[PDB]
Amino acid sequence: PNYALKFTLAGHTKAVSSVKFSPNGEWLASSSADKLIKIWGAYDGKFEKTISGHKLGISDVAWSSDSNLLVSASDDKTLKIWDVSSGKCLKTLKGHSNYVFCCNFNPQSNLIVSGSFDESVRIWDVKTGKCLKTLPAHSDPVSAVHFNRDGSLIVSSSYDGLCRIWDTASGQCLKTLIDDDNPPVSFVKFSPNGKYILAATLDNTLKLWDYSKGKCLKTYTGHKNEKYCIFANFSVTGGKWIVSGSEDNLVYIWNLQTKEIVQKLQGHTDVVISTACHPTENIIASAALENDKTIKLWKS
């Protein structure tokens, strides 16, 4: 465990919100809220092209199989259906009335969910884009949408710790999960099997929650997450690894069985908004907000 700095991805006008790697080692664009998506690289920061022309800042952008097809979850209550080599507004998604926080293409590449805050969540079509359903996704605003390994389950996060695994074919979720905290959950996600969900309970104790029982496996220590948005990552390249984001200008990389403090990596100048992981190689990015305006690549 000697993960060393390799590159630096600067050149931002506003704060960077997210990094999300390509599924097979292709790209990592500037998924920020700066009205800019510059197609940066994952291996060496290879600048490809400029895809911009937005009205407001993008909360997060989606991703595709070829890491090209996008849809903008911007803050102007609209969504364009994007392509890299087009630069053209195909259609417009309408049905929100607040911040479009999050949107996803499923791993089968045939759905466009779009998360909202006043529960105007609509699951859209990739081809047509017709108004289908308002969803009562929580009692609270949504802070995560995700699709599992195959694409029949939708996890969603709340401001009181609702791990609702929404069904794709029917629309009725199965199991309600809870903690004794009152957690404003910034992010939940699936696993490579869909059974363990890492929520956000904000007293420096983030828990990996089971599918059926709703218990936790191993409650980690030594991390800093009480107010700010921090993603949730795992690594399958070599052995067991735990990678997350930080707040105190560090890079959080640990192991699952230990629950210790064995590696933290200085090098940032802001609260780490985002880290991410790569399946075959230990190529790890680490993004931060406006007081850094860089995305620093890491590699063993």
């Binding site: 029917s170 309600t176 696993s191 059974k195 496996l217 399958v236």
Partner: protein, 347 residues
């Protein structure tokens, strides 16, 4: 299991037949003027309109790969299409008009086609090497045949009553029985359908009686057998003849449509009683009935109108509260005053 009206489709008139894929996502509405309208469920939209022909498209069949339909008409062309952009790959202008097409489920080079008069002969995709399926009597002029579930055999049916079973490509005569219709008068066959789990199958006879058999039972019977039916279904009150039968998503709930009255009847495989009669517009005549494999919703084709019959989940959605059980009277209990398992998360 379907209990409502739930909506219908006024999109394109003159609907004639349809079926589904393995997954149940689209809907290939066959039309009178040579069209296949494709409609979606979860997005409720029409993606592709293949204006195939000008003649009545009679039969349809999806394949397993999700790419290859097959159809025929009074155009009498054994066509084929693809859902990406409407690519008619092949075009077999043939005589002797067609009733039913049917793939082998995984060896999808081989399709099985029923002509008007003579025996069904197994066509292919590329070559014209049709494999002649030998029917002995040949005086019945309407003989229907099919695979089993896994494509492991070929089941046949004449108009006299004799049933023969052949191997899927080399035609091993392994089973032979005449059906026990009446005492002195037998009857013909109009369809034989198959499930998605198990080898039970129905015999749509023409004395208003459906008969149900299993594959293991007739393979135990074999050559010169007298297989008794698992179940005998009819409706002696209304005196109704049948048009088209099918199965459920598990092979438990037989859905047989009428031919007089625009009504659906639903049985059970195990017990064998009626469970619910469905209804719709009383002034139509029903032709084709589609069952959905993973979620029990039915489609009914009559007068160009195709209807969606769900059950609405009137019980409730229970997504939020497995907890929070109800106390009717104001029950009070106000006396009171106050790292074990490692499963592969990365699997």
């Amino acid at each position: 299991y379907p209990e409502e009206a739930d909506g219908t489709l006024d999109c394109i008139s003159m609907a004639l037949t349809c079926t589904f894929n393995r997954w149940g996502t689209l809907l290939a509405v066959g039309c009178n003027d040579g069209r296949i309208v494709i409609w979606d469920f979860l997005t409720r939209g029409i993606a592709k309109i293949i204006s195939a022909h000008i003649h009545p498209v009679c039969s349809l069949c999806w394949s397993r790969d999700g790419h290859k339909l097959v159809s025929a008409s009074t155009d009498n062309i054994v066509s084929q299409w693809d859902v990406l952009s409407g690519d008619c790959d092949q075009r077999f202008r043939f005589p002797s008009p067609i009733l039913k097409v049917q793939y082998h489920p995984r060896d999808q080079n081989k399709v099985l086609v029923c002509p008007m008069k003579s025996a069904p002969v197994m066509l292919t995709l590329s070559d014209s090497k049709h494999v002649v399926l030998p029917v002995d009597d040949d005086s019945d002029l309407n003989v229907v045949a099919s695979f089993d579930r896994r494509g492991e055999y070929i089941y046949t049916g004449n108009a006299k009553g004799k049933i023969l079973v052949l191997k899927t490509d080399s035609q091993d005569l392994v089973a032979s029985f005449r059906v026990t219709t009446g005492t002195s008068n037998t009857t013909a066959i109009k369809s034989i359908e198959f499930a998605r789990k198990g080898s039970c199958f129905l015999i749509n006879t023409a004395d208003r009686i459906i008969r149900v058999y299993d594959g293991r039972e007739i393979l135990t019977c074999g050559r010169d057998g007298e297989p008794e039916p698992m179940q005998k279904l009819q409706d002696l009150v209304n005196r109704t003849p049948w048009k088209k039968c099918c199965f459920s998503g598990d092979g438990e709930y037989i859905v047989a449509g009428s031919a007089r009255q625009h009504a659906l009847y639903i049985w059970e495989k195990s017990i064998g009683n009626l469970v619910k009669i469905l209804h719709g517009t009383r002034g139509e005549l029903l032709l084709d009935v589609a069952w959905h494999p993973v979620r029990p919703i039915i489609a009914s084709i009559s007068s160009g109108v195709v209807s969606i019959w769900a059950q609405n989940q009137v019980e409730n959605w229970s997504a939020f509260a497995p907890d929070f059980k109800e106390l009717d009277e104001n029950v009070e209990y106000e006396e009171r005053e106050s790292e074990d398992e490692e499963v592969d998360v990365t699997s």
